[PDB]
Symmetry: none
Amino acid sequence: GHALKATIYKATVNVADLDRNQFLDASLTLARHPSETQERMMLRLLAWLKYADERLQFTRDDEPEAWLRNDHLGIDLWIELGLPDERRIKKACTQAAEVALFTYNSRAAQIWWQQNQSKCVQFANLSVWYLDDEQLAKVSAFADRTMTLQATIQDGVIWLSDDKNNLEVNLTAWQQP
Amino acid sequence: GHALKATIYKATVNVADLDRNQFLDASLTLARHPSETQERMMLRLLAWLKYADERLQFTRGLCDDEPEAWLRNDHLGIDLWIELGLPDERRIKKACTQAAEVALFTYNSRAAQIWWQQNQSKCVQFANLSVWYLDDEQLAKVSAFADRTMTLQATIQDGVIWLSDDKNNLEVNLTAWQQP
Ligand SMILES: [Cl-]
């Protein structure tokens, strides 16, 4: 049947979330379409690491970047990227117990946040994280066709590591429930 | 038959080794004889983490003789011999001649400085010997993780070991006195 034209990336990841006491090994598969920049892909991956779960899956139209479904087939977590509009955010928030949004394009995001902050506050179950240009570029450097990563999370800070390098990642919390 | 009088410790351990590109889960079991200090047992556990392998087994001679842990190959030979303490020439010789690779974990500041001063030039003669030291301070902090039932996470990068459980998180820096 149908298939996506895309580049396949594999990541063996170890996550130690010391805030949550969440310890997990997973092997992730990311499909990157020519329309997706390296950064946005790595932001996806970062997103996954922050909400690491055995059940948390990527997916692709109008679906989230990733979702975690429960035993009754409903959406526990909806992960979204970019700078969505009123109708898009409403779609996610009313369809999912929790929504986590990752905003990223500095110039674009500030204008979007100035024009939306007051409207996003309307959704009781919405989290908004921002990651600035520099950090996004640094996260993106970790990109490899085959990746082996370990992520330690403590006090909101994400310590991201491979064989060669070590990076402190600090997501900014624009909104929290 | 025969059996050791000892206290049993269980450890679920997850190791994320970035130096060796190896992620591993294991259920360890340590038997601690009354003669063994808590520190020495925790040093064993740490050494297991550094050389983590599905086949790396602790062992003690019931009949002393044996290493603290060894890793046997498919032809029943010893690939890795892990030794703890401050052994003499004959003991070291026995380990290095019987094993492809020997890892010795020295500890106790006072005794070890003397030992290394009178042995540096003699260990160097064994081309398959690695000597790691852990200082008194670090050892005590590693010792603090001891519980009869343990859940441990370890990340390794640049020879540094980030060790953690549900309470605490600790950076461990073994000193390399000698490498092959
Ligand atoms: Cl692996």
